[PDB]
């Protein structure tokens, strides 16, 4: 079985890139034919981004000498601008003109999960319906190959032109293949502009040094493919052969030496004996009507029957095989099957909350690992455009210029899915302890709750004043 799937013995990058197309193609096959990939990407979406992905700008006020109040007001301005620019209802923020920021993050994270890499391009849109002429078009991974599909070279390696030190200079984007009859032409695309401008945002997780591509799926999913095939076929055979039945006719006849002599005489010159016996047996079956049930017994003149003696008859064991292996690959691939297909077998209280909190912290890990890159890159490009357009005003006491301290000025964090609910009592006792001991700040409280302290305080002011005015109890 190791024949149809073969690992070379070498560093992972040189063991994957030669068989990149086959592994990725069979990955496409399984993610299309199989529901597990859809469920996994959907849960990753709903744990990492969830409803939305919220920007929070925190310029390094302490290091830059900027006042915290000026930083906070400038952040208010940039947050209002960014939310109003992102909430465009006409899907107009993409060059394809059919994806908002939500689906920017969606397709980016999905493709960085599947192929391990995502490709964003900051292009200059001309549609004047918005103040900001920068859109972000996502680039397929099929596009990145060496110019004219040539094999890897000295410095042109699977489509990326690098130096001897590996520094990613640029890329050869092959032309799109949709419809299925466009030819591919390779075009030069630099990774970033010299001034720090993020033109081609290439975010991938390298497992080792010098690696150019991300992680796969199929190269650990062939075994589900062939287990589902084998369980499927074995259930089919079991079902079809629980009551397969042979309906033949035998007789006494069979006078050993006499039967053999009759057969030999028929073979030599006395076939009339066989013809007469066949006629008698045909008359037998047409005067009997030899019929078993609703159907006719298949015509068998005496002396021939099937021997449907069977193989071993122990239990198939597939039960504990499949539970063990589903277990196995479930906290292999990472998301547990007791919800990837939802068993409720013997699961208990500590079971539930321990599994939930470890899995949720681990999704927080993946979120902070493979979402903040895209978030910061897009925010940096948008903030550069805003500074170009003088939408928001930089602090006058800027210790470093915007172009010099884009990292310092464009320092930001992002908020993923909403408020976690698992037990209730858990979150509420945590909340009461934090609010009584002061062990929670504005920033981490809002991180835990998916809200904002400024708005909760303003709305509590509104709550109290409306209760006082209408006669309610604050």
């Amino acid at each position: 079985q190791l024949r149809s799937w073969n690992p070379p013995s070498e560093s992972v990058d040189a063991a994957l890139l030669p068989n990149f197309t086959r592994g990725n193609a069979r990955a496409d096959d399984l993610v299309r034919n199989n529901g597990y990939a859809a469920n996994a990407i959907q849960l990753h979406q709903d744990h990492i981004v969830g409803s939305f992905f919220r920007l929070s700008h925190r310029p390094s006020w302490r290091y830059l000498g900027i006042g915290e109040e000026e930083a906070r007001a400038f952040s208010r301005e940039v947050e209002a601008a960014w939310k109003e620019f992102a909430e465009d209802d006409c899907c107009c923020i993409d060059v394809e003109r059919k994806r908002t920021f939500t689906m920017m993050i969606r397709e980016g994270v999905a493709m960085h999960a599947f192929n391990g890499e995502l490709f964003v391009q900051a292009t200059w849109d001309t549609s004047s319906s918005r103040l900001f002429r920068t859109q972000f078009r996502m680039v397929s991974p099929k596009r990145i190959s060496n110019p004219n599909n040539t094999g890897d070279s000295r410095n042109c390696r699977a489509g990326v032109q690098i130096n001897d030190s590996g520094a990613a200079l640029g890329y050869y984007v092959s032309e799109d293949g949709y419809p299925g009859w466009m030819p591919q032409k390779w075009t030069w695309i630099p990774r970033e502009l010299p001034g720090g401008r993020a033109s081609f945002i290439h975010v991938f997780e390298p497992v080792e040094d010098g690696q150019t591509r991300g992680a796969n799926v199929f190269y650990s999913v062939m075994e589900q493919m062939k287990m589902l095939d084998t369980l499927q076929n074995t259930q089919l055979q079991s079902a079809i052969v629980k009551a397969m039945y042979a309906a033949t006719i035998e007789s006494e006849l069979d006078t050993q030496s006499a039967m053999d002599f009759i057969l030999g005489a028929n073979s030599q010159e006395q076939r009339e004996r066989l013809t007469g016996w066949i006629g008698e047996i045909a008359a037998y079956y047409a005067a009997a009507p030899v019929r078993l049930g609703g159907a006719k017994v298949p015509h068998l003149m005496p002396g021939d029957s099937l021997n449907l003696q069977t193989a071993q008859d122990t239990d198939n064991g597939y039960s504990v095989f499949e539970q063990s292996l589903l277990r196995y690959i479930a906290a292999g691939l990472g998301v547990s099957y007791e919800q990837l297909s939802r068993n409720y077998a013997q699961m208990s209280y500590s079971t539930a909350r321990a599994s939930a909190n470890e899995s949720w912290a681990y999704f927080m890990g993946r979120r902070k690992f493979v979402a903040s890159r895209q978030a910061s890159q897009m925010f940096l490009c948008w903030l550069e455009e805003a500074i170009v357009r003088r939408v928001v005003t930089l602090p006058s006491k800027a210790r470093f210029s915007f172009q010099e301290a884009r990292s310092a000025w464009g320092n930001c964090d992002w908020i993923g899915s909403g408020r976690m609910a698992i037990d209730g009592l858990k979150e509420v006792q945590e909340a009461v302890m934090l609010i009584e001991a002061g062990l929670s700040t504005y920033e981490k409280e809002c991180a835990k709750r998916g809200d904002d302290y400024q708005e909760i305080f303003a709305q509590q002011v509104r709550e109290t004043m409306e209760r006082r005015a209408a006669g309610l109890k604050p």
């Binding site: 299925g180 009859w181 466009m182 030819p183």
Partner: protein
């Protein structure tokens, strides 16, 4: 190797034989043709007394029910090394695509394939209704003569006795011979389709030329059929009562081409004669496990790995089309 559904033609233009006389298709799940199995004409007269009803009526047991269908499975290559048929200036950039070249070349290949089986089927048809005998034959295959049973009065000859060539080119009227051969045809004749020189010496008689009506006088859908297949069927006109047609179709054999029709022949019969298109088993594992063992045709596109590591288009069929009533047509060789 492209899927089965890539078999779209909408091009059914057989020369008025398999579409007009031989509509009666019977693809089977079994190898041979079993004329006893086909109901054909049903025992169709007797009633029962007004007290109770009678016995059970069956398919009335055809005497001969065993002939070998012409299981024809040819193939070709669609190797993307050719420049193809370029319809005038529809963006040859897609021809430059191997995908579009390969798909429309499998289109071209397969259409050649069914028109090949159609032309061999038309040779079978012309043998059938010209002598009642068909030669199920081929190398590495025994020649089976499949006979519908054409009678002797259906094979009577014009050269016997007095020939139309050996007659008065001005005063003699071959209409007398027309009803003479039509009477023993088990029905009415309404098409007098000739081979070219046969119609030539037919019309050489004056009586023919001032008896025939060149006008449309559109009788039936045969004018529509001629407008469709303006290639080799030629609607000469009306002979008054009967329609005059000429077939000059040609088959292009292994090294040469020649007409389907013999030198001077005729078949007198109806346009609604009953023609059977019994079809045998299709010997393709794909066909059996998807249930196309009983069908008309089967295409496929498929790759060979190994010695002939290539990719081909394969067409499979098994027709054994015949005529239900060989006595329906009188077959005459002319002067």
């Amino acid at each position: 190797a492209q899927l089965l559904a890539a078999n779209e033609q909408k091009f059914k233009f057989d020369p008025l034989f398999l579409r007009l006389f031989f509509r009666e298709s019977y693809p089977f799940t079994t190898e041979k043709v079993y004329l006893s199995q086909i109901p054909g004409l049903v025992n169709m007269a007797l009633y029962v007394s007004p007290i109770v009803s009678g016995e059970v009526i069956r398919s009335r047991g055809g005497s001969t029910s065993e002939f070998t269908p012409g299981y024809v499975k040819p193939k070709h290559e669609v190797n993307p090394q050719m420049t193809l048929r370029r319809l005038p200036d529809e963006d040859p950039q897609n021809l430059a695509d191997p995908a579009y070249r390969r798909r429309r070349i499998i289109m071209q290949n397969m259409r050649d394939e069914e028109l090949a089986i159609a032309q061999v089927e038309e040779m079978q048809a012309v043998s059938a209704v010209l002598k009642g005998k068909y030669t199920m034959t081929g190398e590495a295959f025994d020649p089976v003569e499949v006979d519908m049973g054409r009678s002797e009065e259906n094979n009577i000859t014009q050269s016997g006795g007095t020939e139309w060539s050996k007659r008065d080119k001005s005063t003699y009227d071959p209409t007398d011979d027309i009803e003479a051969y039509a009477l023993n045809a088990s029905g009415v004749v309404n098409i007098i389709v000739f081979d070219p020189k046969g119609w030539a010496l037919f019309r050489s008689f004056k009586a023919v030329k001032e008896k025939l009506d060149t006008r449309r006088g559109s009788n039936s859908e045969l004018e529509t059929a001629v407008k469709d297949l303006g290639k080799a069927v030629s609607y000469k006109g009306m002979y008054g009562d009967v329609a005059i047609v000429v077939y000059s179709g040609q088959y292009v054999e292994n090294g040469v081409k020649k007409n389907f029709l013999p030198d001077n022949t005729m078949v007198l019969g109806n346009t609604q004669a009953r023609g059977l298109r019994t079809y045998g088993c299709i010997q393709d594992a794909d066909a059996q496990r998807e249930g196309i063992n009983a069908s008309a045709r089967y295409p496929k596109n498929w790759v060979t790995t190994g010695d002939p590591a290539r990719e081909f288009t394969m067409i499979q069929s098994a027709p054994l089309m015949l005529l239900a009533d060989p006595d329906e047509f009188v077959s005459v060789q002319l002067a």
